[PDB]
């Protein structure tokens, strides 16, 4: 019992964090094998005016780098641009490199943030990629390079390196190929985020877990058709639901059909009536059906 936005254990990722310092800039890097990845704006002279990243790279002096994992200091053999990231070849292999892949996450998918400061893991929390391709994190200045990751069957799937902030709960990274999520730029310019839409599939996972956990007061005694709901959704900040198939397993443990929850969503949208649901007073799309099943059942 209990639903908690949690994080997978950070142990295997913790040993891959380095401090990457260039001139007076310092941030975090990810050190895998003999390569360190980190945001390229560590070689910028100032993050207040537009940056010619190609220029900074051409005038870059290797000896100006100081990369360290604790007091293991890493010699820099080479530097290449990888989109919004720098691919730095170092003279030592990280012997604690886990088995890993890279994967670009899509909106509505959950992953873990290992929030890092001055090259050291500071904390860990779960996040969910919003439809405007930002995450609701807690990064201060100097947290750039913090990795996002999932763990499946002993493999670490890296999906995120923190890059920038464009609002209070609004954080943007690149995947490990260097592609900025949402196509935002790593420039101190006027960019604003796109509007967000609640991932209806995730909200339904949340409300199922609410029922499983004995919270039922909000459950509608009406029903709305998926097609009907989808026409309502595009006008009230919610994604359409495409496959009702994955909730078959949930509608057994409870005697509640999707169409019942979908009517509940419409009233709960913009109102919980003074009450809460598992601590929440507003619809959350941070939980996927996978997350919820893992937490209630271990399957």
């Amino acid at each position: 019992a209990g639903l908690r936005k949690m994080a997978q254990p950070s142990g295997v990722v913790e040993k891959c964090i380095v401090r990457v310092c260039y001139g007076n800039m310092a941030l975090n890097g990810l050190w895998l094998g003999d390569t360190v990845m980190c945001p390229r704006h560590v070689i910028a002279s100032s993050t207040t005016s537009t940056i010619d990243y190609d220029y900074a790279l051409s005038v870059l002096r290797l000896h100006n780098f100081s990369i360290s994992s604790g007091n293991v200091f890493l010699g820099v053999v080479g530097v290449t641009m990888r989109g919004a990231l720098l691919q730095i070849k170092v003279n030592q292999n990280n012997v604690h490199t886990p088995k890993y892949t890279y994967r670009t996450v899509r909106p509505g998918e959950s992953f873990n943030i290992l929030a890092c400061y001055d090259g050291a893991a500071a904390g860990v929390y779960g996040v969910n990629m919003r439809s405007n391709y930002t995450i609701r994190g807690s990064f201060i200045n100097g947290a750039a390079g913090s990795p996002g990751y999932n763990i499946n069957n002993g493999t670490v799937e890296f999906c995120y390196l923190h890059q920038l902030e464009l609002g209070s709960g609004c954080h943007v990274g690149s995947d490990l190929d260097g592609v900025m999520y949402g196509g935002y730029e790593d420039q101190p310019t006027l960019q604003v985020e796109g509007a967000s839409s609640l991932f209806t599939e995730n909200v339904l996972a949340f409300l199922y877990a609410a029922l499983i956990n004995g919270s039922t007061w909000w459950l509608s005694s009406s029903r709305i058709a998926v097609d009907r709901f989808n026409e309502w959704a595009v006008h009230n900040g919610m994604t359409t639901v495409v496959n009702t198939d994955c909730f078959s397993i949930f509608a057994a443990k409870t005697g509640v059909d999707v169409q019942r929850l979908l009517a509940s969503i419409q009233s709960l949208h913009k109102n919980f009536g003074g009450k809460q649901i598992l601590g929440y007073t507003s619809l959350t799309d941070e939980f996927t059906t996978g997350e919820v099943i893992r937490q209630m059942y271990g399957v």
Binding site: H41, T47, N141, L164, L166, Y184
Partner: peptide, 4 residues
């Protein structure tokens, strides 16, 4: 934007 803030480059963190």
């Amino acid at each position: 934007g803030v480059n963190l």
